[PDB]
Write a protein that binds this ligand. Structure first.
Ligand code: NAP
Ligand code: CL
Ligand code: NA
Length: 364
């Protein structure tokens, strides 16, 4: 009898897990689902409501209070993180949160079977702070690569999980390492599609061309990405497949694309003129969208949108970090060899997530 604890339930993956876990034909089902986040749940309709639990996992008292009673939990899906200005700080804050979850859950869940930990491709590249300062691995990235000799909160979380799994015989684990996520959640700290949608909406509102804010390697080189639903399916697969247990796995869509073409897709979905690559002039979202708070609010008012603030949906630093750099590919061989054959057409998926942003009235 399967009982999920989604930690970070309003997040970009938490949300997909929340929609998918309760479906009738979901492997491991029928699933009971608990969902944890700090903010109150948004007032949008759920086809299959989950048991929502308000908790700050960084507080040991609150996590103990909120999660100890949840004694029927079989599977933990850890899909959150704390974003801090230095990687030392990231290790500090992220380790406490994760240890808080495990300390409350492991002693109190007699049927606990599995811990699914989501990290990412920075496993192979090193922390945001190291970018361009540090030698990283040769792509395509495979899971047999050794850890870089530079601190990474991902490594710290893995070690905690391995330690803590020895508390309970039978308890297995998995690690999930996506690249850039194409998904839905206006609650997310890193949401590329959302960010790009808001930018495109503003361009349309102002009668401006959708200028390309990025580098040539992003425009004209190969990129890949990781679909939020596919990632949720990957978590679920590890939860149910014996060949997935006690292994780290990459998750990406199984195809490649170029922003040259995705940018044209974006433009078409918003009815806006498409910018081409601008040589020898460097263009950042952070710069172009500076001071656009009141223009965004005007858009929300004029189109009866969900009332968002520009900083909560236009994650410009994240979009610039992606579009301003070359994309280094990972490999899905290991996933496929262990039995995960899921994939997504990234172009079709992109349109679908843009449509979802419009259906939930984040953008017009
Ligand atoms: N998003 C991407 O494009 C991307 C790409 C590759 C890897 N990853 C990795 O995936 C992991 C993070 O997942 P994500 O991007 O899916 O996160 P996310 O979209 O930013 O969602 C985070 C979720 O956790 C909740 N949360 C944050 N702090 C909490 C706390 N103290 N107590 C309880 N809930 C808390 C948030 O809700 P509240 O704020 O209301 O509490 C939210 O529901 C990271 O390791 C990240 O590096 C992300
Ligand atoms: Cl990452
Ligand atoms: Na999809």
């Amino acid at each position: 009898s399967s009982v999920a604890l989604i930690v970070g339930v309003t997040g970009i993956i938490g949300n997909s897990l929340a929609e998918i876990l309760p479906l009738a034909d979901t492997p491991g089902g029928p699933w009971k689902v608990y969902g944890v986040a700090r903010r109150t749940r948004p007032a949008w309709h759920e086809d299959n409501p989950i048991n929502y639990v308000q908790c700050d996992i960084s507080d040991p008292d609150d996590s103990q209070a909120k999660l100890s009673p949840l004694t029927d939990v079989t599977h933990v899906f850890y899909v959150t993180w704390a974003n801090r200005s230095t990687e030392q700080e990231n290790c500090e804050a992220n380790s406490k949160m994760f240890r808080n979850v495990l300390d409350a859950v492991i002693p109190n869940c007699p049927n606990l079977k599995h811990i699914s930990l989501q990290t990412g491709r920075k496993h192979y590249m090193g922390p945001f702070e190291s970018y361009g300062k540090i030698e990283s691995h040769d792509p395509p990235y495979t899971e047999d690569l050794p850890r870089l000799k530079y601190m990474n909160f991902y490594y710290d979380l893995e070690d905690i999980m391995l330690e803590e799994v020895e508390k309970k015989e039978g308890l297995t684990w998995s690690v999930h390492r996506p690249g850039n996520i194409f998904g839905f959640s206006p609650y997310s700290m890193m949401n590329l599609v959302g960010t790009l949608c808001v930018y495109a909406a503003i361009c349309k509102h102002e009668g401006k061309v959708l200028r390309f804010t990025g580098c040539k390697a992003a425009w004209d080189g190969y990129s890949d990405c990781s679909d939020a639903d596919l990632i949720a399916e990957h978590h679920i697969w590890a939860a149910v497949d014996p060949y997935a247990k006690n292994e780290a796995f990459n998750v990406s869509n199984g195809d490649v694309f170029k922003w040259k073409h995705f940018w044209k897709v974006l433009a078409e979905q918003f009815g806006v003129e498409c910018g081409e690559y601008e040589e020898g002039v460097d263009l950042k979202l952070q710069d172009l969208m500076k001071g656009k708070e009141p223009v965004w609010e005007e858009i929300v008012r004029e189109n009866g949108l969900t009332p968002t603030k520009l900083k909560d949906v236009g994650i410009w630093w994240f979009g610039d970090v992606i579009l301003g750099n070359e994309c280094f590919l990972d490999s899905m061989n290991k996933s496929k060899e262990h039995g995960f054959l899921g994939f997504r057409n990234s172009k079709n998926a992109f349109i679908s997530w843009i449509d979802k942003a419009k259906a939930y009235k984040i953008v017009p």
